Amino acid sequence: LSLQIDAAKVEAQNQLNAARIAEIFNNMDLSKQSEFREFLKTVASFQQ
Amino acid sequence: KKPETPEEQQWLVEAQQAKQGQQDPAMVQAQGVLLQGQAELAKAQNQT
């Protein structure tokens, strides 16, 4: 029973690890897209 | 001999339950050396 409860900690470690990495992965990706749309209006008015 | 109540009815037949009650858990301990092989098989398979 001690091997079973110890093995359940490894299972819960990976389940949390999949979520925690995916949260910050989506946040950093979104920041690159957000600033990109702002730069389009900056370049457009500059050309006129 | 077994009780047939010829000299007893609270005398010997009371302590009969206590002598047999002491004998039974101690028998499992004596047989415990046969349970040593079962121990090596049990925790090794679960760990894998």
Side-chain angles (χ1 to χ4, degrees):
Chain A
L1 283 70
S2 298
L3 286 156
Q4 288 169 3
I5 191 59
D6 183 59
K9 308 301 171 57
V10 185
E11 293 174 3
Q13 182 173 6
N14 298 125
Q15 287 171 2
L16 291 166
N17 195 58
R20 292 174 308 203
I21 300 176
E23 284 172 0
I24 194 166
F25 166 60
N26 192 64
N27 203 351
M28 294 301 296
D29 193 8
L30 185 58
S31 299
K32 300 169 185 178
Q33 298 175 63
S34 294
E35 299 296 298
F36 195 82
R37 300 187 300 266
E38 301 186 303
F39 299 145
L40 294 167
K41 301 190 296 298
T42 307
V43 175
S45 192
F46 197 81
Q47 189 175 2
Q48 307 304 112
Chain B
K1 180 60 183 176
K2 307 172 186 173
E4 296 179 359
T5 61
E7 58 185 359
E8 54 186 295
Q9 59 189 2
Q10 187 177 359
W11 180 218
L12 305 170
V13 62
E14 183 60 63
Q16 177 171 358
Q17 306 177 8
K19 187 178 178 181
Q20 294 174 359
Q22 184 61 63
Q23 184 58 247
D24 296 348
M27 187 178 70
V28 190
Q29 296 175 347
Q31 292 175 2
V33 295
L34 287 44
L35 277 51
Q36 295 180 301
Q38 305 176 13
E40 295 175 6
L41 182 59
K43 59 183 174 293
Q45 287 288 347
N46 197 75
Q47 185 174 1
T48 302

